[PDB]
Each structure stands twice: as C-alpha cells, then as structure tokens.
Amino acid sequence: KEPACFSTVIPGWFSEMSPMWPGEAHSLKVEKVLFQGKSDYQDVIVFQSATYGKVLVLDGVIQLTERDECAYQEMITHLPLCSIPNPKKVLVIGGGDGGVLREVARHASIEQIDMCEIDKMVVDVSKQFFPDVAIGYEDPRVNLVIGDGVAFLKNAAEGSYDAVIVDSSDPIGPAKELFEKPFFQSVARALRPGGVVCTQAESLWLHMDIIEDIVSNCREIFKGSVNYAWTSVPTYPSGVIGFMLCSTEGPDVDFKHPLNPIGPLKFYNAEIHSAAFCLPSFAKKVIES
Amino acid sequence: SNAKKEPACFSTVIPGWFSEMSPMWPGEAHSLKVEKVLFQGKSDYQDVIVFQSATYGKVLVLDGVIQLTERDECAYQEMITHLPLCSIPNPKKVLVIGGGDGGVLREVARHASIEQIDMCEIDKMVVDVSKQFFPDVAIGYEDPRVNLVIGDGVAFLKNAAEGSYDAVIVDSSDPIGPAKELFEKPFFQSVARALRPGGVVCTQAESLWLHMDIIEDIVSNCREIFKGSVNYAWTSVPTYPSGVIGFMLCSTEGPDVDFKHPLNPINGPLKFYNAEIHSAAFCLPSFAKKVIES
Numbered sequence: 001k002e003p004a005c006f007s008t009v010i011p012g013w014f015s016e017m018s019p020m021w022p023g024e025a026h027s028l029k030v031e032k033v034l035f036q037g038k039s040d041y042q043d044v045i046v047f048q049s050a051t052y053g054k055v056l057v058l059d060g061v062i063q064l065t066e067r068d069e070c071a072y073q074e075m076i077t078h079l080p081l082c083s084i085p086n087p088k089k090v091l092v093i094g095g096g097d098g099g100v101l102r103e104v105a106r107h108a109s110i111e112q113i114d115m116c117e118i119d120k121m122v123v124d125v126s127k128q129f130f131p132d133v134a135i136g137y138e139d140p141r142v143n144l145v146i147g148d149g150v151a152f153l154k155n156a157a158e159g160s161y162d163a164v165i166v167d168s169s170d171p172i173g174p175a176k177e178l179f180e181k182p183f184f185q186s187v188a189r190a191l192r193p194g195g196v197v198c199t200q201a202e203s204l205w206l207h208m209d210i211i212e213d214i215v216s217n218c219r220e221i222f223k224g225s226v227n228y229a230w231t232s233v234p235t236y237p238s239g240v241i242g243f244m245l246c247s248t249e250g251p252d253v254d255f256k257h258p259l260n261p262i263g264p265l266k267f268y269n270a271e272i273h274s275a276a277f278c279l280p281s282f283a284k285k286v287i288e289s
Numbered sequence: 290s291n292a293k294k295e296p297a298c299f300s301t302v303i304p305g306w307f308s309e310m311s312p313m314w315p316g317e318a319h320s321l322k323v324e325k326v327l328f329q330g331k332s333d334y335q336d337v338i339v340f341q342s343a344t345y346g347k348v349l350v351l352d353g354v355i356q357l358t359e360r361d362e363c364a365y366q367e368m369i370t371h372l373p374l375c376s377i378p379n380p381k382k383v384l385v386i387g388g389g390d391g392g393v394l395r396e397v398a399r400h401a402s403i404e405q406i407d408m409c410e411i412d413k414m415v416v417d418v419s420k421q422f423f424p425d426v427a428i429g430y431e432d433p434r435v436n437l438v439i440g441d442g443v444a445f446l447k448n449a450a451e452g453s454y455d456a457v458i459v460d461s462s463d464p465i466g467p468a469k470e471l472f473e474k475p476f477f478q479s480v481a482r483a484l485r486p487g488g489v490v491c492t493q494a495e496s497l498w499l500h501m502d503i504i505e506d507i508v509s510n511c512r513e514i515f516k517g518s519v520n521y522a523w524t525s526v527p528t529y530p531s532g533v534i535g536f537m538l539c540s541t542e543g544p545d546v547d548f549k550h551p552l553n554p555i556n557g558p559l560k561f562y563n564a565e566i567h568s569a570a571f572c573l574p575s576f577a578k579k580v581i582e583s
C-alpha cells in the first residue's frame with residue numbers, strides 16, 4: 001500500500017472509489033505497484049494485481065486489466081465496424097492503451113487509423129507495461145496524435161470518416177466535454193453520411209440520468225440510427241459498460257444486425273453483437289422513450 | 290459465555306465498508322459502504338448477516354458472501370424464474386430449492402398457470418431474517434400456493450414422486466457451505482427423475498469469468514443426464530462476483546423445449562426480464578461458447 005487509493009487497513013489492496021459510483025468499490029489484491037506519476041492531465045498508476053494481471057488506473061479509476069480487457073476492446077471496436085460495409089478511415093479518441101488500435105487493425109478493409117489521445121504519459125506506460133494491448137501502435141496504418149480530441153474533431157474535414165470510436169475516461173477529468181452535445185455535433189460533421197460513432201457511454205445501473213441526456217442529445221444530432229449497447233466488464237464499476245452507436249442520415253445502418261462480420265477474438269461474435277442491444281426492461285424503457 | 294474467536298467481517302479493507310472475500314474469487318472483493326448492521330446470527334448451517342448499505346439498500350450475507358441487495362435483486366430473481374417458466378407451456382407444479390429470501394417465490398407467483406409452489410430451504414434463519422428486514426418477502430410467502438419445507442434440498446429431491454414437477458429452480462448459495470452437493474451429479478440425476486418428460490431445471494451456475502472449470506463440469510454432467518435441451522444463460526448482477534451470474538437450463542426426454550425462443554410470454558411490472566433479453570442471455574462470449582457447446 002503506497003498510493004492514497006490503497007487500503008489504510010491492510011497492505012496490498014487497491015479500491016476503486018469515486019463520487020461517480022457512491023457507496024461502492026471494486027477492491028483488487030496488488031502484488032506490486034509498477035508506476036506512479038502525475039502527467040499534465042491525470043494521476044497515473046500501473047500495478048501488477050494478484051489475479052487480474054496488470055492494471056492501468058487514471059485518477060483513481062480502473063481503465064484496464066489484462067484479464068478482462070478483451071470484453072471492452074472487442075465490443076467498442078467491432079460493434080461499429082461490423083455494422084458498416086468496407087470501413088477504410090477510422091478515428092479513435094482517447095484509446096491511450098492502444099487496445100482499440102489492435103482491434104481496428106483486425107479489419108483488412110481499413111487503410112487509415114487516426115488516433116487522438118490527450119495524455120502522452122498514458123501512451124508511455126501502455127507501451128512499456130502492456131505490450132499485448134499496445135501492439136496496436138505498431139500497425140503501419142496508425143497515425144498517432146497527442147492532443148485534445150475536442151480540437152482534433154473541430155479541425156477534421158467534413159464527411160471524411162467512416163467511423164469514430166470515443167474510447168474515453170469518465171466525465172470527471174479531461175474527457176468531460178467528450179460527453180457533451182457540441183462534441184457529438186463535431187463527430188456528426190466529421191462522419192460521411194451513413195458513417196458511425198461508438199462512444200464509451202457508462203453504466204445503465206449507475207448513470208441512467210447521464211445516459212438519458214447523451215441519448216436525447218444523440219437523437220437531436222444523428223438522424224440515422226441511435227442505439228445503446230451494453231457489455232460485461234467485471235473490472236468496471238457495476239460489472240457493465242455501455243456504448244452509444246449512432247449513424248448520420250444516409251445509407252441505412254442496422255447496428256443490431258451486423259452486415260460486415262469480422263489470435264482468435266476472445267469475447268465478440270456475431271450473436272453477442274445483436275444480444276448487446278437487448279437491454280433490461282428498466283433501461284430499454286428509458287433508452288428508447 | 291465465551292466461544293471460539295471469529296474474525297472481523299466489517300471494515301476489513303475500508304473502515305465503514307463490507308468487503309466480500311472468498312477463495313471462489315481470489316485477489317478481489319466487492320466493497321459496499323455500511324450504514325448499519327441490522328443482524329448477525331449463527332444458525333445450524335451458516336453465518337447470517339443483514340446490513341443497510343449506503344447506496345444498495347439492505348443486503349443479505351451468508352458465510353461472508355452477498356446473497357441479495359435491494360437495488361439489483363430484480364436481475365437474478367426475474368431471469369432465474371422466467372428463463373425456465375417462460376420456456377414451457379402452462380406450468381402448474383414448481384419446486385424451488387433454497388431461495389430463502391423469497392424473491393424467487395415472488396417471480397414464480399406472477400405465473401397464473403402455477404397451482405403449487407413447493408420450496409425447500411435448509412436454513413430457517415434466512416427465512417426469518419428475510420421476512421423481518423426485507424419489504425416484499427413476508428407477503429410473497431403468503432401467496433396461498435407456497436408450500437415451504439425446512440430441509441436439505443438433496444433429501445427433498447430423493448422424497449419427490451417420479452415425473453411430478455414441470456420445473457425445478459435451484460436458487461442455491463455457493464458450492465462452499467450447505468449448497469455443495471446441489472452442484473454434484475447425484476442431485477442433478479435426482480432432479481431429472483423428479484421432473485416430468487419435457488420438464489425443466491434452472492440452476493444458479495456461477496460466473497463464466499471466474500468459474501469456467503466448475504461450469505464445464507456441471508455442463509458435462511447435465512449433458513450425460515438430461516437428453517432434452519441443455520443451455521447456459523447469463524445476466525448482469527452488479528453485487529455478484531465479477532458482476533455476472535449464470536444458469537444451467539436443462540429439459541428431460543419429452544416434448545422439445547426451446548429455451549432460446551420462449552413460447553410463454555409474461556412486485557409491480559418486471560424491472561429486468563423481457564422476451565428480447567430472454568434470448569440475449571444465451572449469447573455467450575466466444576471464450577465461454579467454445580467450452581460450453583464442445
């Protein structure tokens with residue numbers, strides 16, 4: 001126990017505390033802290049955990065563990081790219097571990113992977129400590145930009161992207177404006193007609209108010225399809241994460257029935273793609289109202 | 290009276306917080322902030338805790354493991370009940386094993402066709418504390434169709450008439466403790482015997498992220514026993530280890546049972562279950578699907 005998010009009661013325990021999920025915390029046994037640093041944007045920790053392999057933490061929040069990252073990486077990537085024909089040019093906002101790069105690379109149709117990550121410290125420790133995730137960076141198709149995805153999207157050419165994937169941290173910290181309407185509007189402008197967005201869109205158990213405004217906002221902006229998907233990620237709070245899938249008006253996009261089917265994938269397949277749009281009654285009624 | 294020292298259960302990792310520990314999920318714990326510890330008791334089977342959480346309402350704990358929070362209980366009780374009951378026509382006779390919180394009882398009651406709900410819970414203390422501290426519970430013990438027995442469900446199944454149940458739901462605690470043999474081949478054989486032809490069992494069958502060795506053993510055993518359908522489904526439960534849990538669905542030799550396409554549609558309205566997510570619960574991640582249908 002060295003970092004302030006580590007136990008005052010016993011050595012070698014990390015607990016994920018945050019006002020974003022009050023009264024609850026996922027606690028993980030720590031074999032060793034591998035890195036602590038303060039970047040320009042974030043407090044950054046990597047630790048070797050007993051049972052989840054290596055762990056990336058940003059401002060006290062678990063961004064990734066080796067044991068379960070296939071769930072988030074595969075779903076956030078293949079939900080959008082398997083939903084459209086022949087994707088060629090794709091933009092990753094955040095994605096500092098390079099996991100999304102690794103999944104995007106699986107698509108042979110892809111010619112260009114642009115990535116805009118605000119925090120070089122995250123890139124640094126990701127290539128050093130998680131090479132099986134950060135292998136993403138090695139694909140000759142990748143262009144890596146260190147910068148705020150807000151500004152990058154503003155300077156993107158209108159109608160230039162087949163897909164945008166917003167692999168962002170939580171609304172507390174530098175990803176704050178990535179959750180807000182003007183950022184969604186710049187995504188829309190930068191997408192071809194029938195082009196798609198896939199965002200990190202929180203917990204239906206923990207964040208329904210937030211998700212309800214994101215969806216209302218996306219319905220004002222994207223006149224194609226607007227859909228919400230969820231997945232299991234044990235080491236995210238509540239055990240689940242969700243995604244906004246949105247298309248700009250034009251060629252029809254059916255996110256629930258992928259027409260572009262893709263080591264072997266460890267999580268994603270064509271059936272769980274459609275199953276992730278099958279929300280629980282309490283959520284479904286909100287999401288589609 | 291003094292007795293044998295029992296370790297601290299509360300504030301083991303964060304002062305004011307319960308952390309859920311077990312060798313069934315090594316090197317991790319779900320932690321919940323504690324407002325008030327309502328009950329601590331030792332029965333003839335288990336350590337029994339009830340506490341008021343800060344953000345998950347009341348929480349039942351058995352042998353240090355969370356069994357239920359008020360906030361997320363709708364996911365397990367709706368799925369483990371309607372996945373089986375919505376897969377067979379006009380169920381009349383249903384057996385619940387364990388289920389001492391009475392949640393399953395409640396979701397079983399939503400079914401008009403049902404005429405008797407047999408229940409066998411080994412631990413009278415869990416019944417008593419669930420009725421005391423939890424709001425829907427004592428009422429959803431009062432449905433005239435409920436026949437509650439205190440006993441080991443292994444014994445109850447050996448007592449049952451051959452082919453006498455349309456459906457059995459095993460709402461059990463983990464293999465460590467009194468539920469051990471509900472996971473084992475002989476109890477499964479005895480469920481298949483108690484079921485009619487085309488009859489259905491739904492079992493609490495752990496986490497695909499945590500328990501794949503265990504799950505492959507249950508599935509392989511079920512395939513040997515139940516010559517109908519054998520299918521594994523999963524759902525989201527935040528306060529269960531890894532935040533998912535699963536269910537073995539099996540039907541015996543008889544009228545075909547399609548657990549994936551439920552022929553039967555269905556505590557106020559359902560909060561969680563719906564026809565679409567019935568189907569979605571059988572769509573497993575690739576690493577699980579290989580092991581489970583191989």
Ligand SMILES: C[S@@H](CCCN)C[C@H]1O[C@@H](n2cnc3c(N)ncnc32)[C@H](O)[C@@H]1O
Nearest residue numbers: 063094096117118119122149168169174175
């Ligand atoms: C690490 S990734 C989440 C883990 C699951 N792939 C989220 C990244 O978002 C970055 N981030 C946050 N805000 C921004 C903005 N505004 N722009 C770019 N990148 C951002 C942050 O530095 C993380 O590395």
Ligand SMILES: C[S@@H](CCCN)C[C@H]1O[C@@H](n2cnc3c(N)ncnc32)[C@H](O)[C@@H]1O
Nearest residue numbers: 356387388389411412441442461462467468
């Ligand atoms: C509380 S319930 C699970 C929580 C979500 N409904 C699980 C119950 O199984 C009982 N249980 C455990 N072992 C057995 C046996 N062997 N027989 C019957 N009931 C059992 C145990 O006492 C709990 O009340």
Ligand SMILES: [NH3+]C1CCCCC1
Nearest residue numbers: 062063168169170236
């Ligand atoms: N808790 C958040 C951290 C980033 C990815 C998942 C959401």
Ligand SMILES: [NH3+]C1CCCCC1
Nearest residue numbers: 355356461462463529
């Ligand atoms: N860990 C288990 C305890 C209660 C039953 C389902 C999950």
